[PDB]
Amino acid sequence: GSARLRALRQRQLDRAAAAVEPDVVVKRQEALAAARLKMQEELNAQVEKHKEKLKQLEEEKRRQKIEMWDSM
Amino acid sequence: GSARLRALRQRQLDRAAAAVEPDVVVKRQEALAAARLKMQEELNAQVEKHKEKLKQLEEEKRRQKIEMWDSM
Ligand SMILES: [Cl-]
Ligand SMILES: [Cl-]
Ligand SMILES: [Cl-]
Ligand SMILES: [Cl-]
Where is this region: VCP/p97-interacting motif (VIM) (chains A, B)? Predict the structure, then answer.
């Protein structure tokens, strides 16, 4: 071994432990939570868009029937 | 006037009346009804597709929540 290698190991240990230090853990959670919020906003907007489309399609179905009876 | 013009008028009258002759009326109705059936089949398939999408989006919303609680 050597002094340089012993220093390298210690720095690797510092890096390995840093992944789960409290500042890192909270920042990484905040990043995950912000991504989840964005994705929930997008899912919600899609849900509303599909509901609106279903409303419109039902109205077109009703119109097709009325139109027929009107044309008689 | 003239014989050719009197014949032309009579043929125009035949054409004008032909639009509402019974064979024409039934064939034109069958064309309208076949178009309506096609459009109703397409509306119905769209309705089912949007319902399926809504089902999937609701499942993704639920998954996002479970995943969070699981990650704690
Ligand atoms: Cl470590
Ligand atoms: Cl849509
Ligand atoms: Cl006529
Ligand atoms: Cl869809």
Answer: 28-40
Cross-chain CB nearest to B47 (options A46, A54, A64): A54
Which helix (H) or strand (E) segment holds residue A46: the answer is helix A22-71
The ligand whose atoms approach the alpha carbon of A56 most closely is: 2
Helix (H) or strand (E) holding A56: helix A22-71
Contact B71 A32 (CB under 8 A): yes
* Resolution value in angstroms: 1.5
The percent helix, strand, coil of chain B (3-state, each to 5) is 90, 0, 10
Token readout for A60 is: 């077109």
Mutant choice from B41, B54, B58 vs A, greatest count of A C-beta within 10 A: B54
Of A43, A46, A61, the CB nearest to B40: A61
Resolved by: X-ray
Domain boundaries, chain B: 1-71
User: Under CATH, what is the fold of the domain B1-71?
Assistant: 6.10.250
Nearest to B41 by CA among B49, B29, B30: B49
Note whether B64 contacts A32, CB cutoff 8 Å: no
Is the distance from CB of B46 to CB of A50 less than 8 angstroms? no
